[model samples]
Target chain A: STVIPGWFSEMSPMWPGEAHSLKVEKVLFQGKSDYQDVIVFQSATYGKVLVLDGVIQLTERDECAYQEMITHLPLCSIPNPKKVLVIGGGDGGVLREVARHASIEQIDMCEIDKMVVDVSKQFFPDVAIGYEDPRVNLVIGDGVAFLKNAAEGSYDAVIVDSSDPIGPAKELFEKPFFQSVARALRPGGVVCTQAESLWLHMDIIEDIVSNCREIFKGSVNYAWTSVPTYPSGVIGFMLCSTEGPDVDFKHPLNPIDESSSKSNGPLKFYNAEIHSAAFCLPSFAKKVIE
Target chain B: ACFSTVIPGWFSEMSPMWPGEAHSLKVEKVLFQGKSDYQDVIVFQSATYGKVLVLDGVIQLTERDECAYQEMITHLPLCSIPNPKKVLVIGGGDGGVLREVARHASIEQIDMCEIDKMVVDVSKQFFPDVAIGYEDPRVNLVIGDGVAFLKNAAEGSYDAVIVDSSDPIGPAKELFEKPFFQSVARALRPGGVVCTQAESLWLHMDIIEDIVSNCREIFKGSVNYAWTSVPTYPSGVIGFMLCSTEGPDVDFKHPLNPIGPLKFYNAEIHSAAFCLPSFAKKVIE
Candidate 1:
């Protein structure tokens, strides 16, 4: 609780037996939504930080690293992903990154809480930049329900950008939800979900992977990305493709190119090589999932 | 001192935890204890991060994240050269670097000179996989001062000189000096490349600039500052300073090492690393 006599904020109980503290310059805003509690804060080193239910969503300094990877690695892996659905990314960080791909004809975002969206719009305009796009169709509803209602053989790709298996987002990791995703895909479609930290929640991830393997027809793989603000400084994703003669999730169809104007917005971390590197696991980790 | 390996006793060190910031791992058990003439060494089995090796007070290598440091430090330089036969590793007593170096069957002899014998012994006891390189017949493990060892060496002796030392503290302060670069240059043959664990860009940009500037004066070929995301370090980043004695136009982006069954270091990854952000680019150039 004693954070800024020196640093101000102590994010204890973030991960089991570990915490990441920061020097909070100020608490920008705080609100309780219909779904969860939201808090916006500023810091010296991490820049602007968005905290939801006492967990970090993204930081101004390194949010792009997480946002870009989640959107691009899955989006870019498909040959031509046009109709895309992003579930539970209320902050619009993922929506904005999804907009970077000009190949996408339409983008749909289903976020349960309207308050998180409004708070993000007011506090984090740059991050909430996705709502400004003409093609984006924002729906405030439960992601699991939204996916279940989706037309089968529709979306080219589906991305689940929910938080840790907490509150309403917990059902997003269930096998029933994954079955809905597989049934909704437009043949050769891929799905990437924001799985929990391998460092913190490998047990849960193994379950998610098992569910994905049973549901998806093609290939299933788990990849990771590291953000300083995240619990354990690392987070993972479980990628599944239901359509294809063969699917290679390790390599991307369209890589992030810094030199190209249309590739992605002012990219900092995600690239094709780093995309491949994310899947490369340690011997101990590979043993668990493989 | 690159390795601040610690002994967690009553007189045990807590590492150089800066007043404003620190990263702590849940200490599971103290694995081994050894005090070298150079520094104190301790290995602790962690609840979260397997086994952690601390020298003096600084974290040397944890069984968890050491692969990132050791792989990047060794591969970046070794992959740059065409046929690196005879190589020298100064102060990587943990042998993680040596283990990576031995991966290149092309390397005829691998010479490692560590100032602290206790660091090597402790690593052998605590980190069996890391210390496994000692059993390789091609490796010549020399327990001596690296600077003094390099000075007595033949001119243009090794193909690559890797400095896997600790931070520039007491004994290692001389390591980041101009004279040290001169010794490294002499030991490097034509087209020989040298890579050292240069600190972080987030906190130690000044140190990086210092190493690059000094290296520029003596190294004649080329000098580079590349970094990798290391969450355990001071600022969640660790940088490497690479130099070539004769390979000025070294194709670092297109490394000699092929991309097949490799974990972290690939040709594209090499290209991506050199493409640092504008901020790091400004600090270097």
Candidate 2:
């Protein structure tokens, strides 16, 4: 038997831990082809949460890193981000970050699974808090259909926080979705989405970048961060814009001035510095970006 | 308990008795030791002034490509300092820093104090390229504890002090603490600078923060953090702490030895290296 390294063994998520316990709370669609459910459980460090089709991965405590970076980078970069659209983020994490920016006056959040919204409210209260913000108008419908009907040049920023490109998220990565996103954003608007890992999913990223380039005009930049739980311990994001902004991509936002504002609440991770450094890729990533 | 394994019949007599083809590089001498960890460190003096410290089968340090660390650490301060001369090197047994130090023509003499004499011996034997700078005559090699050596050195002697010690697990731990830093500050002339490897920010944020805070209290100068990428290191990112009483302005465009042939070291990289990722900046700032 091969002796595994101690550090790898200790950090393995698959190890028998309290977080991996399987206890089904309820079943949504008990069909032959697909079965989706909403389950509640305590996780290792992220506290209690709900899962869907083992999709829409969100931890109760540290959802801000993923949510804030995903939503805010593109939103803040746009010239006048008054109208925003978020697709598939039923947990409301993306909406939370979007609503925090006072510049964003209106936001349309389309989450297909009603069960996801209900479970998020019941268990993950922090994420669910964004839903109560007046600026957000929640709609329970298919994200694809919602995008299909959206007027051309309608929104300033479009955020796609969908699950992996499997099952329900399959259509979101297709050519039609890219066309819809391009048409929905203004001439100078921006679009951002999670592009998975540069290590394991290089082919997928290549396809996404190629497709996005065909649709968008200005520039396409790929950035990444080290998220321990993610596969291969890294996550990639693609930033697509029609008009490239002049601001520094690394330091996306100003530093927090007040101590109370800095410590507004307990954040397990995700700060101004991590936000900037996440975009600093290694040499291999530089090759990919070039 | 020596576990002996059999070699294949096809293996030649010249080759070791291992399953696959084996190549043996000659061993030189032991370098440093930490009793807590059951590992013996040795430096193998090889061709091309190549230095290697093997803990077991693993090569801990190499001289040829160590420019990735040494160049970044040395050049950052030399370029940052208004007029840097009379430098001090602590724990750079392999003389890689001296090689980089020589790039700066303004540097008059370098006082290299290493704790391990064996490391210098191995470097002279195996790593001629790295050890070549020892013959510069201006280099003063003192075999003793670097901290103790610095304490005994005359006050305001060096324009810059570069600490190129090993990881902060054993004797090197004090190098990261406040008391030793106070001595380093006292040893430096006014407007003098100090730069040292602080380890990976990703793996040890608390330690990075602590070092930054400690250095801040000891030195009245500006404290800044920078990072570099090395494949062999964990996370592929390493941090450095730069402190100066007169507030040295880092000049990436300027080189101490403008005539040296460098393939990777450039002005763009010097400036770009200071750009910290969000996570690392948060830990220090």
Candidate 3:
């Protein structure tokens, strides 16, 4: 309602008491689609930032911190992640990280909004590199509807890369979504979805964990990584195994070879040591799953 | 801007712990700015972090996240040692360390040494909750420098010596050096442990290495570098230097008695903080 010509914000009622603000160098794109509101701005500090429905989705500076950890933690833990499915990752950030593991044969990305995908590719070419890969199958539709019709035990690993549990994205955090995810995974497959922050959204994490426990009859873990740009400087993942010996998400079998000299390209934030360390939460976060 | 920390009401040079960047926070009001005999002490009613405390232009603690620091530096050493009846706090004038130290019922004497009384008075008025430890009867508050305090302290008088000092810039700079660590070694009784807030591994790797290297000379026991995430701190991280004079068998990994009912410090987290990432491990290892 008010105009601060040089600035933009994604203030959530969820955190009514706090906000994450950034300086706008310029507005690259601003529009509304059938699904939700979309805006892409070039920030003075964080570079190109994509915002959806008043929430920060990804920024050029620190997207690797979140995208790499979310993609690799489960993909690396599960042995030979071949066929993978990603939900709501229109920004192409998650798809980009998954493409790093050449062993994966095919990847299907289901995103509800077509505008998010188009703008990310148009303005954020650096992040939208995965579109060039021939293996990526882009499906423009609701993730819940797409997963509901998928064959049971069809995919090796499913990653839910969506915005917050708010307008147009509400169903993704509910119990039915996880049930669909579990149904879509193959035997000994895994699922990793973006959970809420531990500092402000522990209650939401608790709700997500309790819902996933009833359906996914396997080892489930709540792990997190620290990213300064994100709200509260941290974000978490609700990881569950769908049905090998039920892969252990905490201890990644192919832990990133830290001994190698910076072999992980474009992956600045994640390493093998951080994979197990993410599950070792503080007393407040640990209390939720316990 | 939704996420920008704009202290709109008043202004101070609010820099992030990182070197090249800065952030601003809204000051709902100005609480205190006093000229201490030793250093400058200031207080502000911050919009994001309630009751902010700044000493000599360096951010020490705020009401919102001080517990993460105060609880860790205090409880880690206190819980590892066998029933610390006597404990000492050096250079934490705001009384945050004192509050956590007072939580230990078995700590018969909680001695605090602060060089500046101005910081304590301003805090007592502005940050009463943090300064609440001054109310406890076991607290023996002394307004003096820690360097000479440890020099005069009887040999092997205390079970645990906790150094909760400011940055390695001003008055507290001496505390980060060698002779002071030797004084700490002399002040602690046999089989005692000492925990100090070293610095950030992300920004101050040189400082952390120097502290570890100096402590290695002073104590024959085990020395460990443990860290916990504090967003406002430099690089969104903070580390601790835990040294034991007890023996090589001293366990900094597990607490003898788990610090009860805490939001941050636990045996699992205590063990996990030592698991530094490869880059940070290169600095210490």
Candidate 4:
């Protein structure tokens, strides 16, 4: 029903009163995952698009902006991070970016649905290639549960590449989960979570930033990047740091060096200059989040 | 059949240029709908967006968020230079850009050349808050073509030129090409800047790259691409192509002038606007 004659329309209660539709060339696959409904389709302009529960997860055309921003915002903010934890990035795009940092030796990604990983590997291998890294320990389980049992102060950075705070990802945005993630982070460690848009969900973004400000003793900043596929054509990230040496989340401590071997290839998004610029929110957003 | 996408109670902008995507605003009441000499013009009361102005089936501005577009387009260039004495505004008939320009006390004279007098008249009747700048003493409203005015304009005449044009498919197509930019560069004084209405970085990288690449050759100084969020526009964002001439090059990153508190376009935002996402930086830079 979502696909009419030629276009795939996304109309949801999440972003009430507005809708985003994409031109559908063909539907590659459609089924229900254990957690949510999964659908893959070839778009006329945006290549292959992945959707979960009728919401766009990523498009091949613009996934780089979301993945690179979500991964690098926190990793680049802190000093050389040796270990990183990524939650809910079943597509493995976040892992692709996490592996770019040479200072990171181990990457632990915990996702609740293995079906998401399997589907990504089958359809979006370019993104799913994040799993091929020898350092990745892919744990197919709940992220909340994994974080609960995680050793205290073990990770240098924890990236919560979660969906909206509905369905399976609801707990990831709660105060309890934020407390656990903060505890799991080492001193001076950073965390970047997928915050919703400033234009559409300022209320939700404020609640997360306020909650994280209390949970983490260090800097709590809100940065956003442009993603055309996302609702309102933009998305934000909530970056927080555990108390340690004062870490400035705006200025990247270790910017990506494309000339170095650590950088896998040319990044389509996320540069050193943009890392600081991302934090410069519009006045309306700054008033509430800042 | 006139506006096929615009059904009753809603105005849907479904363009092939931005394929498969549609931006629709629920119409509370149709205030005005007619065709001008240039293109189609419509004014309507939206359900939540207060008032809206649509030219050539594309959203020009919404009353609620128009400040973001008007303020950024006007202030981004005016604030970059130390003291902009005279300014020329091209193609913004709504007077929103002129209203923003009027805020700067340093600007002694304001010359506005708009092709459509109906858009200005309609804005005055419907959106007084936006068209209020026409009442300013500094404004010199000229109802004519922007391109011809710039072609005949004196060398080093204005301190800044702002092209607040619509999309490139119709009357505004020439405004995006090199000759218009060449004319703008000639009209500006040394260290003067020009900020034009470039399309979104996400959806229109090819167009933006073309404009930026052309501007690099035309303007002796810097050429930069900046963007801002506007939900009413396609892709929920719009960009500005900022260029400068020789002498002290306008600092695209930093704002030299002090423009007081606004809903958008502050000193931080002025600097931040120049910072493009990696995808855009790769193409435009």
Best by lDDT: 4
Model 3 per-residue lDDT tens digits across residues A132-221? 677889888878889999988889898999878876576889988888888888767899998987777878889998898987887888
For model 1, residues B114-218, the per-residue Cα lDDT tens digits are 878788778787778778878888899898888998999898878898888888866687888899988888888886888988876555668888988888888
Q: How would you encode candidate 3's per-residue C-alpha lDDT over B71-105 as one tens digit per residue?
A: 78888888888778988888755677887888888
Residues A138-250, candidate 4: write the lDDT tens digits. Answer: 98988898999999999999999888898757788889999999999988888889888887788888889888988999988888877778887779988889898888887
Instruction: Tell me which of candidates 2 and 3 scores higher on lDDT.
Output: 3
Docking class of 2: incorrect
Best by TM-score: 4
Worst 10 residues of 3 chain A by lDDT: A258-267
List the candidate numbers ranked by DockQ, top first: 4, 3, 1, 2
TM-score of chain A, every prediction, order shown:
0.94, 0.80, 0.94, 0.96
lDDT of 4 by residue, B1-285 (tens): 133542334567777658767776666787989888888898888876778888877777878777788889999888888878899988854678877899998888899898888888788888887677888999998889989888997999989999987788865789988888889888999888999989888778998888888889998887888898777778877899888998886678887786635777777777788888766787775
lDDT of each: 0.74, 0.63, 0.77, 0.83
Model 4 chain B poorest 10 in a row by lDDT: B1-10
Docking class of 1: incorrect
Candidate 2 chain A least-lDDT 10 residues: A3-12
lDDT of 1 by residue, A1-290 (tens): 11124343334454643445565678788888776778887776667778877787778877876788788778878876789998878689888888777777888888888878888898787877888788898988778888888899898888988887765567888888899999888777889998887656778989999999999988999987656667656688988888665668887867756554344456666666677767766444676788
**Docking quality (DockQ) of candidate 2:** 0.07
Model 1, residue B28: C-alpha shift (Å):
4.0
Each candidate's DockQ score against the native complex?
0.16, 0.07, 0.27, 0.44
Off by over 4 Å in 4: A1-4, A261-263, B1-10
Global fold similarity of model 2 (TM-score) = 0.63
